Design a protein around this ligand. Structure first.
Ligand SMILES: Nc1ncnc2c1ncn2[C@H]1C[C@H](O)[C@@H](COP(=O)(O)O)O1
Ligand SMILES: Nc1ncnc2c1ncn2[C@H]1C[C@H](O)[C@@H](COP(=O)(O)O)O1
Ligand SMILES: Nc1ncnc2c1ncn2[C@H]1C[C@H](O)[C@@H](CO)O1
Ligand SMILES: Nc1ncnc2[nH]cnc12
Ligand code: NA
Ligand SMILES: [Zn+2]
Ligand SMILES: [Zn+2]
Length: 295
């Protein structure tokens, strides 16, 4: 109502929003209630993140259910082994066709990038090869990138510098790197995304203060990245939500982050930067429109 937000990365396809945890139905599907709470807090658009071919199809199909919903097409670093399970050239084409044939709903290439803290899911050589291959998607579709970078700044920056002309721009989401890393990404005319995972350490809060407002975007990565009392920014949260450990109607569930929690991320960022929250929220929204909704 007061604030307006675009969640640049919400996993609305995650089974937890249908009441399924570890393959077990624990409670009634409350996805519509989760969506409603976010709308009431000011979420105007939801970018449903795709993380592989099938999850990109699932994200688009859910996005087709609501005019506030949009999706991404790409392969997450942890899932890049899918390229070589079959034909990597065919897998790439299937992503391209899905993106190219659904302009309007599909607004970004991604999630893609590098995560050298999850090499148990996909080794470095495969991650490096298939992240760089997705620049074929960005160059052909003219869609901006939704990027992930964990424990991989040098390798990531090398790929981005060599391939920057093959994308129209993009955002490094869940940013958790140094001031120098942020500066190197800003020097490539990229944006920096902040969710709860961006705000866990004292150093994270200091790095945020070095980034201009017009270079930031906001997100939840729900159901992940919920802010805990052990995180450095938790003291700055101003809004709490009715929550239960065991599901009840009208309540969030403990440990399940939601899009409505994007207001907590805004409260932390505004407090850390000592910035008016409405001015910062409007700037974050406008940055997101400029990159992903330029129409
Ligand atoms: N296992 C593990 N180790 C280290 N860091 C991790 C791990 N899982 C998630 N993450 C971090 C990576 C991003 O900063 C954020 C969201 O990951 P996303 O993939 O966007 O949901 O969480
Ligand atoms: N191993 C590891 N390292 C870093 N970030 C991770 C890891 N596993 C998950 N994550 C990310 C995504 C989770 O939702 C959140 C848990 O951080 P918490 O502080 O437990 O609430 O942080
Ligand atoms: N390919 C994959 N197979 C299975 N699980 C996967 C994969 N990629 C990411 N994950 C998820 C589960 C981990 O707990 C989490 C990191 O904590 O990332
Ligand atoms: N435990 C987890 N499983 C899948 N994706 C994640 N992203 C962050 N944490 C995750
Ligand atoms: Na607080
Ligand atoms: Zn990510
Ligand atoms: Zn995520």
């Amino acid at each position: 109502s007061r604030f307006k937000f675009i969640d640049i990365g919400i996993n609305l396809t995650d089974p937890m929003f249908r009441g399924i945890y570890r393959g077990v139905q624990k409670h009634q599907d409350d996805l519509q209630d989760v969506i409603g709470r976010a709308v009431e807090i000011g979420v105007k658009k939801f970018m449903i993140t795709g993380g592989n071919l099938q999850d990109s199809k699932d994200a688009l199909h859910l996005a087709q259910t609501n005019g506030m919903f949009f999706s991404t097409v790409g392969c997450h670093p942890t899932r890049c082994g899918e390229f070589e399970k079959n034909n990597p050239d065919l897998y790439l084409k299937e992503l391209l066709n899905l993106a190219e044939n659904n302009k309007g709903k599909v607004v970004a290439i991604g999630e893609c990038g590098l995560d050298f803290d999850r090499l148990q899911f996909c080794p470095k050589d495969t991650q490096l090869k298939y992240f760089e291959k997705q620049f074929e998607l960005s160059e052909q579709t003219k869609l901006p990138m939704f990027l992930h970078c964990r424990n991989s700044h040098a390798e990531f920056l090398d790929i981005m510098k060599r391939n920057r002309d093959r994308c129209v721009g993009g955002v490094v989401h869940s940013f958790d790197g140094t001031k120098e890393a942020a500066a190197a990404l800003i020097d490539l005319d990229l944006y920096i995304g902040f969710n709860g995972c961006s705000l866990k350490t004292e150093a994270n809060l200091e790095v945020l203060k070095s980034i201009p407002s017009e270079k930031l975007m906001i997100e939840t990565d729900a159901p992940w990245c919920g802010v805990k009392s052990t995180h450095a920014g938790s003291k700055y949260i101003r809004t709490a939500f009715p929550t239960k450990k065991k599901w009840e109607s009208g309540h969030c569930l403990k440990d399940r982050n939601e899009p409505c929690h994007i207001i907590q991320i805004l409260e932390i960022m505004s407090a850390v930067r000592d910035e008016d929250p409405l001015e910062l929220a409007n700037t974050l929204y406008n940055n997101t429109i400029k990159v992903f909704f330029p129409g």
